[PDB]
Amino acid sequence: RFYQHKFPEVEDVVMVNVRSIAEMGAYVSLLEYNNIEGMIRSINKLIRIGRNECVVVIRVDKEKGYIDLSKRRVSPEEAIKCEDKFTKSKTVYSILRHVAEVDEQLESLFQRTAWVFDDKYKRPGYGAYDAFKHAVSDPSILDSLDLNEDEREVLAVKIRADIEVACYGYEGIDAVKEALRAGLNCSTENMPIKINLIAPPRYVMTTTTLERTEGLSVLSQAMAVIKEKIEEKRGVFNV
Amino acid sequence: ATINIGTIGHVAHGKSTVVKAISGVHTVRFKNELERNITIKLGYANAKIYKLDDPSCPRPECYRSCGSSTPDEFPTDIPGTKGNFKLVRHVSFVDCPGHDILMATMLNGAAVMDAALLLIAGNESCPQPQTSEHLAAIEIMKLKHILILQNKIDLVKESQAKEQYEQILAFVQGTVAEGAPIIPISAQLKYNIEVVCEYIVKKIPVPPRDFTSEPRLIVIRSFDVNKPGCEVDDLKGGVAGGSILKGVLKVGQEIEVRPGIVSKDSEGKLMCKPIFSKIVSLFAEHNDLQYAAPGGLIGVGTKIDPTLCRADRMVGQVLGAVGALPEIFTELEISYFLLRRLLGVRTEGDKKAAKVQKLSKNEVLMVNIGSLSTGGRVSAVKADLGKIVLTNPVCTEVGEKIALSRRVEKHWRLIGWGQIR
Amino acid sequence: QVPTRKDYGSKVSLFSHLPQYSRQNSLTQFMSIPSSVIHPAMVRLGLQYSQGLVSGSNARCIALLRALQQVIQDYTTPPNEELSRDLVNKLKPYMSFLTQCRPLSASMHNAIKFLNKEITSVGSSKREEEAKSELRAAIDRYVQEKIVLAAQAISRFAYQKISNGDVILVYGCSSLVSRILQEAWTEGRRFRVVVVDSRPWLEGRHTLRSLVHAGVPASYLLIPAASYVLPEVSKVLLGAHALLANGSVMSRVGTAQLALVARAHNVPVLVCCETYKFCERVQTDAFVSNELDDPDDLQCKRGEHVALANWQNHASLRLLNLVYDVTPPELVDLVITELGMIPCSSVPVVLRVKSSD
Amino acid sequence: MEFQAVVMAVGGPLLPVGNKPLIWYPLNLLERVGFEEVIVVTTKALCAEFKMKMKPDIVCIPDDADMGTADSLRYIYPKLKTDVLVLSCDLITDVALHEVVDLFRAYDASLAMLMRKRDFIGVDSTGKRLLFMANEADLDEELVIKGSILQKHPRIRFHTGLVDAHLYCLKKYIVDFLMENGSITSIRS
């Protein structure tokens, strides 16, 4: 089970997934309410088995298991909202399924994980995962979670650039350390963060993912060190 | 670091637990290939010696003086006493084993030690397989404090016991051993260590040793700990336990290895740019004495490229001070002679020892310049003058420790030596 | 740098429309080892395709389509030219050399017709990289859909036709025969199989080696012994190299012989085909599209007195080994396709499921 | 793409000049069929006699002073992306070379050798798939066959007296294996 209810209410847009092809249409199951089954010339080919497709609800049920789904009269500009209802809630379902490790305990966990926020501020499947992203950055509202303690606080590539800069002289290595820590000092003021080293022979220094194309910053700071201080003591360079 | 003392032992008697018994610290490294009967590295220990009206030879442990070279029979002596152990001389034992495979090890750490002790084996045959081989490379480097460290008569049978050592001392005409008297030891029973281990230090004085000359260092270690997935700030140089031969090495002392990698348009040898190296960190075998006495070993820490010190491909590089007295030419001459046997295996045929294959044309050469075995192809080399042809422009000081290797099999041989002009 | 051919041994003038191809000649002696005029990976794939080492029809067409996918992958479109037309008139000499090397099935033929209809469907205003990755994704989902859900669609359709206690004979190695019978046997019916094989190919050794591993009892014989086992069979399926427009099967040498001796004892026969194995054109018999092989593969180990040792120095003895033969309509009863079960002389109704006409 | 090759300098050529030194015909019947953008690794004095070679392509690559054999490939590593042919200098050529490269294409393999016109080398009945070569002194141990490699492959034919030519029709997998396992050397071994 994922959502609080068993069936969505009047005019709710539905992410849905077909299992098999019926005679009236296709037997289309529905994972987002724990696998409930409904309906919708070489149409009968089985190109659609197990793939999520956007749809909207049609009529009004109470309990009787009405699952029909009109692919035609849905609008695709609202289908991205249905995809946001799918993928964010799917990340929620995955991580919250890995929360438990050994049924209705999991369901009562689910109503006391996201439906607390969605009964305090009422956002169905959008502010839940984003409020969890808030909560892993700020668990202040998770202090209201008066659960047992151990369940509360539980809630790529980087450009590995490498230019080996070293000298044989003691004054040479002194200027190497001086201009390397000066390049760290210059990297502090302009603030490209996270330039460290895990290999003493080379400069295994990480052009990280903060702009994802920020090799220009580490590159021109590096080349300023290359042109500035060290390399009048035989700075000879390979890749 | 005043005097070094070198045990020198040839094939097949055991040099691991006897190094443990009388010297204390045993040699170990990584991917070591440490021994099969005797070792193949320099067996070095860290020693501070003291004598307190006691003939015994203690270690810097100041409570007892014994060993563990036998399981059953323990004769022992008056060991000494406690009380913040003193220091007679800055002495430390070293070893130089006797296979023919350790030419790097046996030729780099032998001219740099100070006293020598030649050992006679006790687990070999009735002929002498390698007795005239493994100080004949030490013949040209000209050590002085040399002694017959008589070792094994324990499991030795009586028919080959009491006279054949004189035949070994007569069979070593290629080894400077006639001025080497006998202070005996025991590799198993280690009997009566207070006289047995006494005059291997007490009789031996300082060698002829220069105090304040140029440090013209041939280095024996250049090692480093920078495995894949390493730390951040391991900026060091040659992390070495470094035996020095000449020159005081204080803090701020200057020392240069001039070629290293040969300079631009690599057919010359020198450009006037000295190699500036300030050795501050110096480990005096248990302490950080920055003021290194000549002759003895000290734990040397330099400051160069750390990439260049992982795998020591620099066995015997000349690091000399200012005042560049070494030579500048690439046409290497020697005043050589030949090995008379071709020995290393025992037999009664006199057939592989027939002749001495000289230099040729369109034929290879290799010879450990110090401990550096380079070569190349030759053009026209005469009969009795040794003109070594090479490929490395190196301002080495004097290659007075060379061994002319020559292929006959998977292993090379020993055919020559030589003294530089 | 011109693609060349030859004849070898002798080629019977009764089949003057039909070529000969030798395989023990040299196929790179004309062509210097690097080339950009014909793409090298597709050339070495055609060389695979003429060392005999690929013979299964859906296997060889998927191999050729993986190859032409790799050709359209790495060749970027250069500027100052027309986008699609340059690529398609480089693709035509490609398949010319390919059907030159070893000749054409139906699968290659309507496959390259599909890629031509695709490359003329590509919008020229779409820029290069996304168009290339788009056509890449388009044709590999095409072969993905067609081949693998054709396999499991004929599985889910021909599973409900197989009896229990029945036996079944088959001839030729396709993939989908092994797919239907093994994927049925993983669902637990009750049967036993028998694999007849022929000459010079010794073809169904593939299938026999498969079905001894899949866990089904088998039997093995050759077409002189055909009617000896023919009373026992209760139903027979049959893989096919090439479907036709008049309800026919253009496939391996002795297909129609077992079709005829299967009608001759009244055992009904079904065959398994798909969409992309029928041509647009159609024939009366095989003698206008059937190639030949190496003659000198025929042999017996009857001492060193091999009767076909010095063949070609005699001129009054010809070796004429048809490889790819046709089957009449009203003796094969039905085909099995991705739409289900349709009778044999009703097969051209799939010709206009194109635009639902 | 196929468009590169290389020839190692030393085996395992300064003084020997027959009519020319060791480079008469290998560049001929390497370049009489294609191969006009090649990368040759060299080593000095022999690197500057390249006008009377009159080849329609020469690209020399020098190295360091005293080097081995896999390091050559490891230093030409940063620019090679496709099918590679590495030769040696212990060669006459008396064969149409298209057949070795076409069989190497014909299995889509990664390795090849030349063993035609002390010495033991095995290959199966078709004459195509091998195990290993045996020499005169490294095989002081006698001869060892693995279990499964003889359990599947029925026979093997040890050859007696032809010569090696140290050709390697080859591709990117084993050179990535060489650059990552750098300390593994001895291309002949």
Curated annotation (Swiss-Prot), chain A:
GO terms for cellular component: cytoplasmic stress granule; cytosol; eukaryotic 48S preinitiation complex; eukaryotic translation initiation factor 2 complex; extracellular exosome; glial limiting end-foot; membrane; mitochondrion. This results in the global attenuation of 5' cap-dependent protein synthesis and concomitant translation of ISR-specific mRNAs that contain a short upstream open reading frame (uORF) in their 5' UTR, such as ATF4, ATF5, DDIT3/CHOP and PPP1R15A/GADD34. The modification Phosphoserine is found at residue 137. One of its GO terms (biological process) is cellular response to heat. Substrate for at least 4 kinases: EIF2AK1/HRI, EIF2AK2/PKR, EIF2AK3/PERK and EIF2AK4/GCN2. (Microbial infection) Phosphorylation by vaccinia virus protein E3 and rotavirus A stabilizes the eIF-2/GDP/eIF2B complex and prevents GDP/GTP exchange reaction, thus impairing the recycling of eIF-2 between successive rounds of initiation and leading to global inhibition of translation. Keywords: Acetylation, Cytoplasm, Initiation factor, Mitochondrion, Phosphoprotein, Protein biosynthesis, RNA-binding, Translation regulation. It comes from the Eukaryota. It is found in: Cytoplasm, Stress granule; Cytoplasm, Cytosol; Mitochondrion. Residues 11-72 form the S1 motif domain. The modification N6-acetyllysine is found at residue 120. Induction: Up-regulated upon endoplasmic reticulum stress. GO terms for molecular function: ribosome binding; RNA binding; translation initiation factor activity. Belongs to the eIF-2-alpha family. It comes from Homo sapiens (Human). The gene is EIF2S1.
Swiss-Prot record, chain B:
Its EC number is 3.6.5.3. Its main location: cytoplasm. GO terms for molecular function: cadherin binding; GTP binding; GTPase activity; methionyl-initiator methionine tRNA binding; translation factor activity, RNA binding; translation initiation factor activity. It is found in: Cytoplasm, Cytosol. One of its GO terms (biological process) is formation of translation preinitiation complex. Pfam families: eIF2_C (PF09173), GTP_EFTU (PF00009), GTP_EFTU_D2 (PF03144). Residues 37-41 are annotated as: G2. Residues 186-188 are annotated as: G5. Expressed in testis, brain, liver and muscle. GO terms for cellular component: cytoplasm; cytosol; eukaryotic translation initiation factor 2 complex; extracellular exosome. Residues 151-154 are annotated as: G4. GTP binds at residues 12-17, 151-154, 186-188. It catalyses: GTP + H2O = GDP + phosphate + H(+). Gene3D superfamilies: P-loop containing nucleotide triphosphate hydrolases (3.40.50.300), Translation factors (2.40.30.10). Residues 9-16 are annotated as: G1. Residues 95-98 are annotated as: G3. Keywords: Acetylation, Cytoplasm, Disease variant, Epilepsy, GTP-binding, Hydrolase, Initiation factor, Intellectual disability, Nucleotide-binding, Obesity, Phosphoprotein, Protein biosynthesis. Encoded by an chromosome X-linked gene which escapes inactivation. Does not have any homolog on chromosome Y. Eukaryotic translation initiation factor 2 eIF2 is a heterotrimeric complex composed of an alpha (EIF2S1), a beta (EIF2S2) and a gamma (EIF2S3) chain. eIF2 is member of the 43S pre-initiation complex (43S PIC). Interacts (via C-terminus) with CDC123; the interaction is direct. NCBIfam families: PRK04000.1. It comes from Homo sapiens (Human).
Swiss-Prot record, chain C:
The keyword Phosphoprotein applies. One of its GO terms (cellular component) is eukaryotic translation initiation factor 2B complex. The keyword Transmembrane helix does not apply. Activated by the chemical integrated stress response (ISR) inhibitor ISRIB which stimulates guanine nucleotide exchange factor activity for both phosphorylated and unphosphorylated eIF2. It is found in: Cytoplasm, Cytosol. Residues 5-14 are annotated as: May bind the chemical integrated stress response (ISR) inhibitor ISRIB. Keywords: Acetylation, Cytoplasm, Disease variant, Initiation factor, Leukodystrophy, Phosphoprotein, Protein biosynthesis. GO terms for molecular function: guanyl-nucleotide exchange factor activity; translation initiation factor activity; translation initiation factor binding. Acts as a component of the translation initiation factor 2B (eIF2B) complex, which catalyzes the exchange of GDP for GTP on eukaryotic initiation factor 2 (eIF2) gamma subunit. Its guanine nucleotide exchange factor activity is repressed when bound to eIF2 complex phosphorylated on the alpha subunit, thereby limiting the amount of methionyl-initiator methionine tRNA available to the ribosome and consequently global translation is repressed. This is Translation initiation factor eIF2B subunit delta. The lineage of its organism: Eukaryota, Metazoa, Chordata, Craniata, Vertebrata. The gene is EIF2B4. The chain holds residues 166 to 522 of 523 of the full protein.
Swiss-Prot record, chain D:
The modification N-acetylmethionine is found at residue 1. It is found in: Cytoplasm, Cytosol. It is linked to Leukoencephalopathy with vanishing white matter 3: An autosomal recessive brain disease characterized by neurological features including progressive cerebellar ataxia, spasticity, and cognitive deficits. Brain imaging shows abnormal white matter that vanishes over time and is replaced by cerebrospinal fluid. Disease severity ranges from fatal infantile forms to adult forms without neurological deterioration. The disease is progressive with, in most individuals, additional episodes of rapid deterioration following febrile infections or minor head trauma. Component of the translation initiation factor 2B (eIF2B) complex which is a heterodecamer of two sets of five different subunits: alpha, beta, gamma, delta and epsilon. Subunits alpha, beta and delta comprise a regulatory subcomplex and subunits epsilon and gamma comprise a catalytic subcomplex. Within the complex, the hexameric regulatory complex resides at the center, with the two heterodimeric catalytic subcomplexes bound on opposite sides. Belongs to the eIF-2B gamma/epsilon subunits family. This is Translation initiation factor eIF2B subunit gamma. It comes from Homo sapiens. The gene is EIF2B3. The chain holds residues 1 to 226 of 452 of the full protein.
